[PDB]
Amino acid sequence: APVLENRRARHDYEILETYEAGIALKGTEVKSLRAGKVDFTGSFARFEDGELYLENLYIAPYEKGSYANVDPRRKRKLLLHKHELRRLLGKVEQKGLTLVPLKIYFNERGYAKVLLGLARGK
RNA sequence: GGGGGUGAAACGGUCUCGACGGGGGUCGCCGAGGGCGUGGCUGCGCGCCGAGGUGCGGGUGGCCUCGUAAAAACCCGCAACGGCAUAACUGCCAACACCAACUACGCUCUCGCGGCUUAAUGACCGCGACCUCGCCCGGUAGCCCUGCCGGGGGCUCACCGGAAGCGGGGACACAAACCCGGCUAGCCCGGGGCCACGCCCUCUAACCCCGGGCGAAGCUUGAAGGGGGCUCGCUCCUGGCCGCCCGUCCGCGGGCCAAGCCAGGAGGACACGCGAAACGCGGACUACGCGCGUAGAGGCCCGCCGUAGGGACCUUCGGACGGGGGUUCGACUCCCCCCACCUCCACCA
């Protein structure tokens, strides 16, 4: 059911800032939301790649049958404007202020989007 | 096994606006702290010979080059030893109050009685002793009742002296290196005019004060006034000299005048500008004889739309609905149709 979001973020790790970004899914990953296959623990933004990236996210597909149970962990790029990014990139790197997926959602224009908050231990 | 039914949180949401790259471009948010250089100015650069050296420099211009000249440099040093020698250049052993910052059988000489009572001495803390020693007294020197006087006022542990009054003891732990008391609260040698919009000898206040002296020395009888003195002219100011001269530097030119002086007025005493004041017509830029334009590692500021000569964002695209083509304002669910998927469909039976 669609209100899947990491509910640790008020009793485990605090959040000091929040940003918005997308990630390249596929529909079987989205179609997970109706059942509930998702938590965001162990998943954080990273850099080592030239683009900013997001990895380790257990979306864990559910369609109807078997259709396309792809690995959900995979690296997907984070577009995340230079006005934000060149005021935050070390937070992504140095992990005491990890930009982490709190929730994934579909936005104003059909795109899979991720809410990124400043966590640690996440 | 396919179709219809299903392939976002249904059906109905297909660039991740972006990070990061690149087409059309901005020069901005973000890297780039605005940036970046083709300049300007020295009233053209130079002078009658001059400046100047090859890794980075000391020395050298008497060696020796570049300057319309007639052909191409050196001695020494940075450059010595990582932990180590002299080479690191004659390395280099450490600091507070003993009689007391901190700690005692203590400390300038013999003892005692309780405290202390857990625990040892009854020297500890409170208390009593032939005496150190204070209170304060017998003294050299050096010092603020320094008037006359009552009286060396008296002293300092450097060097010494009693018992005529004790604080308390074998520590009971730094100011008589200047002070108490009365009669005229004074007298004598003597310097010398400040004071009031500058005063004084002078005068109503006899004419002088009283700063200092007397144990270790020197500047003030005056309010109403002037003739004269002081610092000049009692005091000030009138004309003759005062004051003033265009980047380095030059031709044809050169004046009117306080103060201070030579002298004369006016207010009772500086009354403060009574007025009386001041450059023109021109010019080279190594001085006109002479040439090179580098005597040369310049002195001080700006200039340009414009960053090419540091990056990469605005717009926009490499990159997501399990594929792969057409196609709607709205797609994988309109038309397809492979694979999947729930139900229906195609041997035989």
From Swiss-Prot:
GO biological process: trans-translation
Record keywords, A-Z: Cytoplasm, RNA-binding, rRNA-binding
A single cellular component GO annotation: cytosol
Source superkingdom: Bacteria
Cellular localisation: Cytoplasm
Keyword hit for Cytoplasm: yes
GO molecular function, one term: rRNA binding
Comment field (misc): Athough the Valle et al., electron microscopy paper indicates this protein came from T.thermophilus, its sequence maps to A.aeolicus. The Fu et al., paper maps the coordinates of T.thermophilus to E.coli.
Quaternary structure (record): Binds tmRNA. Binds to both the 50S and 30S ribosomal subunits via rRNA contacts, bridges tmRNA binding to stalled ribosomes.
Role: Required for rescue of stalled ribosomes mediated by trans-translation. Binds to tmRNA (also known as SsrA and 10Sa), required for stable association of tmRNA with ribosomes, probably by bridging tmRNA to 50S subunit. tmRNA and SmpB together mimic tRNA shape, replacing the anticodon stem-loop with SmpB. tmRNA is encoded by the ssrA gene; the 2 termini fold to resemble tRNA(Ala) and it encodes a 'tag peptide', a short internal open reading frame. During trans-translation Ala-aminoacylated tmRNA acts like a tRNA, entering the A-site of stalled ribosomes, displacing the stalled mRNA.
Membership in a protein family: Belongs to the SmpB family.
Protein name, as recorded: SsrA-binding protein
Species of origin: Thermus thermophilus (strain ATCC 27634 / DSM 579 / HB8)
Full protein segment contained here: 2 to 123 of 144
